[PDB]
Amino acid sequence: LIVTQTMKGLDIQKVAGTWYSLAMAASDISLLDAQSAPLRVYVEELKPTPEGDLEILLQKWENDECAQKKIIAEKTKIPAVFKIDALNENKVLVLDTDYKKYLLFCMENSAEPEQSLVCQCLVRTPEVDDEALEKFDKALKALPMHIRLSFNPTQLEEQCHI
Amino acid sequence: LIVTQTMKGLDIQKVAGTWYSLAMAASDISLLDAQSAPLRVYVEELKPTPEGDLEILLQKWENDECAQKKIIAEKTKIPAVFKIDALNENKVLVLDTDYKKYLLFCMENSAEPEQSLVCQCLVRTPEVDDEALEKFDKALKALPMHIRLSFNPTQLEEQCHI
Question: Chief subcellular site (chains A, B)?
Answer without folding.
Answer: secreted
